[model samples]
Target: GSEAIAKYDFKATADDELSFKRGDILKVLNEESDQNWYKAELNGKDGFIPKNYIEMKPHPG
Candidate 1:
């Protein structure tokens, strides 16, 4: 149970990227910096995802 700040469809370029697919729900953990990317929990694991790949979603709680 966590807050989802956005929904994302991952287009991974490498092996060290967040593992998600189109229409997957991304839960916001935090941001990596003032811009660019953010920390997200997806598929039971935490990884950094580009802010551009995500569509911001309102928190339910």
Candidate 2:
């Protein structure tokens, strides 16, 4: 709803926070239409969050 977040990029996935690099194909551990959620792994730990929470676009090519 704020203008700043909409105009900006590079959201940090802090320590113990999770993310997938743009090119990696993440396995779908679960799916539900309402919340737009998915689960992915990085470095062996598993995490779940909304698909909207991660960047659908990769970091710079």
Candidate 3:
């Protein structure tokens, strides 16, 4: 899975955006839909997450 960590807390006001807190783990499902936003699955919900809101942290092991 393409993993990333939330850089900061983000509250989704929109229906499509995903809400996440700092240090939350997210699975990057897809991108290329938008440069600013990436499609991420948070927990069991799939939604859009701002690229700046998360930092890709692919594990070494």
Which portions of model 1 miss their true places by more than 4 Å? 1-8, 11-16, 31-33, 59-61
Candidate 3 C-alpha lDDT tens digits along 20-60: 99999999877445578888988799888889988888558
- Candidate-wise lDDT, in order: 0.65, 0.43, 0.86
lDDT of 1 by residue, 1-61 (tens): 3344344556667655676765777886664357676777877877777777777665558
**TM-score of every candidate:** 0.62, 0.41, 0.84
Name the Cα RMSD for model 2.
9.8
lDDT sort, best first: 3, 1, 2
TM-score, cand. 3: 0.84
Q: After superposition, how far is residue 56 of candidate 3 from its true place, in Å?
A: 0.5
RMSD of 3: 2.0
User: Ten consecutive residues with minimal summed lDDT in candidate 3?
Assistant: 28-37
Error of 3 at 3 (Å): 0.3
Pull out the clashing pairs in model 2: none
Q: What lDDT would candidate 2 get against the real structure? A: 0.43
Tens-place lDDT per residue, model 2, 1-61, is 1001111222336553445554444444454335565555545765654465444434458
